[PDB]
């Protein structure tokens, strides 16, 4: 869906179109970041490095965000492997999606001209319930995550910690140009 | 169930039309339906960066950001992306149709086009501060879409602001007269 032909030098072979693009070292993150979708990205990054550890990897992101722990597994992989992981935003990069976008190799973070970026502090839905001791423990953890995320985004964006703390207190929507001005990406791709 | 056609090689019928550089957008625009379109556009360009691509739209619209990813791809790639409306092109669907290479935007005679301002399906909930942030962003979407549509239609911004205030249905002839499409294909 759909099935595409790559005539190699090896032989003619039918591919689903995403596997076809994976051959060009393009990796997609589309939709919510889950344990399953993030781990699939991690597998593709590792695989692309084993194919060739020196060539750039192109990480295309259209995502509203999702799980922080799922996202960090992508992040640390981007940082560990030898290939530069270029990032590109199409559609949107929000929350963890924005975080991952900003985490591309500096100089190779891109957005399309009408792509949208959004950054904010960590939130939980569903809720924290039960004993005060337990609630304290999880509040403390949620606050630690918030400090780590601000510190790393400031480092990604080349900005002061106090700026990121200020600018993520509530939902902060940015145009591609604003994302570039902020330090979130390097270039906006027109043609 | 999708039928299988023979070309030596057997294909699902849609992958068979993709080989002739035909790409479909059918049904609601989502991250997944839009990204599949983006992928096929990129693929058709790698196969041949100079031949036109034919984008067939039968869509009620959907996600704005999902729509923009297609839009920005259509504009980025070297091939002309011809657009054709069959059935309907409404909202983000209408936007993508009008965005085809000028001179190569088409509709079948009984196609329906519809344009309007951005809407939210569901709610803005929470603190007034948060509602303001999101209201502000919805208005930026409205303003951008109007300016871009005006440029697509070769009209003044004030025309689209007036004409998207409420649901605006057009016949193929009206869409053409408006500057939204270029020709109606009879046969």
């Amino acid at each position: 869906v759909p099935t595409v032909i790559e005539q190699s030098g090896r032989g003619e072979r039918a591919f689903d179109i995403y596997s076809r693009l994976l051959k060009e070292r393009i990796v997609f993150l589309v939709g919510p970041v889950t344990d399953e979708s993030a781990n699939l990205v991690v597998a593709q990054l590792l695989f692309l490095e084993s194919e060739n550890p020196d060539k750039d990897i192109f990480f295309y992101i259209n995502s509203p965000g999702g799980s922080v722990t799922a996202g960090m597994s992508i992040y640390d992989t981007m940082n560990f492997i030898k290939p530069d992981v270029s990032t590109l935003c199409l559609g949107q990069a929000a929350s963890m999606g924005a975080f991952l976008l900003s985490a591309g190799e500096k100089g190779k973070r891109f957005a399309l001209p009408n792509s949208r970026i959004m950054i904010h502090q960590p939130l939980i839905s569903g809720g924290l319930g039960g004993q005060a001791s337990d609630i304290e423990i999880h509040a403390r953890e949620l606050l630690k995550i918030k400090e780590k995320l601000n510190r790393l985004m400031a480092k990604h964006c080349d900005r002061d910690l106090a700026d990121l703390e200020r600018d993520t207190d509530r939902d902060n929507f940015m145009s591609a140009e604003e994302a570039k001005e902020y330090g979130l990406i390097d270039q906006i791709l027109e043609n | 169930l999708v039928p299988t056609v023979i070309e030596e090689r057997a294909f699902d019928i849609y992958s068979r039309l993709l080989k002739e550089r035909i790409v479909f957008l059918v049904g609601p625009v989502t991250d997944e339906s839009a990204n599949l379109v983006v992928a096929q556009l990129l693929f058709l360009e790698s196969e041949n960066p100079d031949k036109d691509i034919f984008f067939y739209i039968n869509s009620p619209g959907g996600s704005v950001t999902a729509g923009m990813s297609i839009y920005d791809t259509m504009n980025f790639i070297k091939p002309d992306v011809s657009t054709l409306c069959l059935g309907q092109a409404a909202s983000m669907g209408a936007f993508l149709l009008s965005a085809g290479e000028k001179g190569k935007r088409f509709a079948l005679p009984n196609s329906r086009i519809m344009i309007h301002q951005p809407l939210i399906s569901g709610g803005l909930g929470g603190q007034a501060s948060d509602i303001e942030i999101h209201a502000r962003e919805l208005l930026k979407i409205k303003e951008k879409l109007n300016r871009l549509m005006a440029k697509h239609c070769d009209r003044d911004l004030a025309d689209l602001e007036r004409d998207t205030d409420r649901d605006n249905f057009m016949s193929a002839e009206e869409a053409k007269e408006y500057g939204l499409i270029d020709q109606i294909l009879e046969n």
Partner: peptide, 6 residues
């Protein structure tokens, strides 16, 4: 998306 990604 090239240049330059790829």
């Amino acid at each position: 998306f090239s240049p330059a990604a790829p």
